[PDB]
Amino acid sequence: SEQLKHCNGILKELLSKKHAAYAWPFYKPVDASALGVHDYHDIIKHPMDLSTVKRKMENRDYRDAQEFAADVRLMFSNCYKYNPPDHDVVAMARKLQDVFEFRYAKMP
Numbered sequence: 735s736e737q738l739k740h741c742n743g744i745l746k747e748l749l750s751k752k753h754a755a756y757a758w759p760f761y762k763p764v765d766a767s768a769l770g771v772h773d774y775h776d777i778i779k780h781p782m783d784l785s786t787v788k789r790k791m792e793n794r795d796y797r798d799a800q801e802f803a804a805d806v807r808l809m810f811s812n813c814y815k816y817n818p819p820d821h822d823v824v825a826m827a828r829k830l831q832d833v834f835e836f837r838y839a840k841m842p
């Protein structure tokens with residue numbers, strides 16, 4: 735699909751070395767305990783990350799571009815939900831989200 739093809743194109747860019755300085759926290763699912771937090775899944779009922787998005791895209795589980803956008807945004811939303819507005823990871827999330835939001839808008 736031309737939209738989903740566009741989305742796959744966005745996913746690839748989000749995973750580029752190009753944005754690796756602020757994207758790396760979003761490459762894989764949050765491992766709370768490992769990071770020293772034990773309340774993350776109390777707060778966050780629906781974890782999401784880029785590898786899972788890439789998985790679903792490979793299984794063609796996305797009915798359209800909107801479902802894709804919803805997951806990517808959920809990933810960012812989870813990060814802003816759990817963390818304080820001044821946290822570094824949050825700043826990393828806004829930088830990557832600006833790449834996503836800008837490419838998503840340029841879709842046919």
Ligand SMILES: CC[C@@H](C(=O)OC)[C@@H]1N=C(c2ccc(Cl)cc2)c2cc(OC)ccc2-n2c(C)nnc21
Nearest residue numbers: 758759760764766769770771774813816817822823
């Ligand atoms: C687990 C909650 C939060 C935290 O306090 O981590 C110690 C965490 N911080 C971080 C975090 C904290 C500070 C910086 Cl500068 C970057 C990432 C984090 C780190 C990772 O390493 C593989 C993966 C995920 C996160 N992450 C995401 C995404 N959303 N919130 C976080």
